[PDB]
């Protein structure tokens, strides 16, 4: 039976893969990291508070200058904040209110956003006019936009509810590459520090590593027991973390093709909204459905701290390029800058 053959070859190949990974599990991450002095205790405080959104904030992305940041909110606003003064730089009117993601271009000249409008909208904030206007709209996705990220001012990658990712040439509006393979809505995207690869997260409970050049899905990482909503690369581009509704975060290592640690506690049953690494990657921060964010010891797998201030869920969070600060977007309509 032509079908039964594949159904079995697929299973045996699965065992083979499983055997390969087990064979590499010669030591545990905790085993080699038990000789690292624990982080101890981290008490980060809110040093600044961005107040201007009238409804709950959905996403946010720091700019390269580690000073400015954009955030999209249910109030139909896309604001660019100056984290230092708390002042607003720009405040673009969103044609929709169901915005899911927003990104900042590295050059700081553009920003993007997307949502149930199934379109990634690019805005220019460095216009020679002094007024932000939609420089381009990237229709193409047949599902909602869950995440988008600027490679540079010409290309952007976006993940969609249509279960695929795409790379776009912003200028022409063309879709230079489509990344398929996932079998559930892709929720997140994170570019490798070298821009040659990117990890994705989907409702199929797995994460996938991709080669931006050949559009191939080089590796698939199983583990989670439910929707993975957050994906984030490790500072050296050889590992990355995840955040699923299974109430756990997991660090997978590309080269060892498997999970190295689970950041959980029988005391935490809420799902993860977003995750990010500190500059040295030693710390792993994560936002939950609860009012708090956890600060984890990436290597010792111990919770070293908490960020407690928001009155509602923390939906998004990130760390500056200089690693100097952490920012979090909540449903309480506020953004808090920590350190």
């Amino acid at each position: 039976s032509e079908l039964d053959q594949l159904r079995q070859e697929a299973e045996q190949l699965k065992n083979q893969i499983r055997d390969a990974r087990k064979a590499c599990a010669d030591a545990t991450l905790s085993q080699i990291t038990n000789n690292i002095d624990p982080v101890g205790r981290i008490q980060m405080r809110t040093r600044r508070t961005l107040r201007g959104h009238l409804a709950k904030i959905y996403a946010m992305h720091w700019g390269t200058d580690s000073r400015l940041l954009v955030s999209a909110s249910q109030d139909g606003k896309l604001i660019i904040w100056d984290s230092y003064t708390t002042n607003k730089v720009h405040a673009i009117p969103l044609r929709s209110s169901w915005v899911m993601t927003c990104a900042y271009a590295p050059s700081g000249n553009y920003v993007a956003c997307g949502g149930l409008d199934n379109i990634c909208s690019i805005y220019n904030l460095k216009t020679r006019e002094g007024n932000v206007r939609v420089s381009r709209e990237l229709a193409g996705h047949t599902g909602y936009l869950s995440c988008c990220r600027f490679l540079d001012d010409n290309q952007i990658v976006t993940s969609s509810g249509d279960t695929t990712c795409a790379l776009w040439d912003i200028e022409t509006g063309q879709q230079t590459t489509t990344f398929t393979g996932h079998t559930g809505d892709v929720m997140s995207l994170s570019l490798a520090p070298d821009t040659r690869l990117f990890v994705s997260g989907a409702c199929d409970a797995s994460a996938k590593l991709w080669d931006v050049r050949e559009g191939m899905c080089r590796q698939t990482f199983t583990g989670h027991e439910s929707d993975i909503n957050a994906i984030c690369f490790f500072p050296n581009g050889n590992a990355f973390a995840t955040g699923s509704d299974d109430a756990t975060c997991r660090l997978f290592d590309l080269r060892a093709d498997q999970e190295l640690m689970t950041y959980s506690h029988d005391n935490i049953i809420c799902g993860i909204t977003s995750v990010s690494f500190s500059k040295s990657g030693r710390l792993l921060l994560a936002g939950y459905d609860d009012f708090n964010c956890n600060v984890w010891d990436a290597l010792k797998a111990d919770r070293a701290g908490v960020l407690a201030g928001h009155d509602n869920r923390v939906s998004c969070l990130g760390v500056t390029d200089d690693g100097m600060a952490v920012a979090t977007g909540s449903w309480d309509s506020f953004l808090k800058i920590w350190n």
Partner: peptide, 13 residues
């Protein structure tokens, strides 16, 4: 599919 997004946007059930 779209429900997942509604969940995220803050909608009951």
């Amino acid at each position: 599919s779209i429900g997942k997004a509604f969940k995220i946007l803050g909608y009951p059930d």
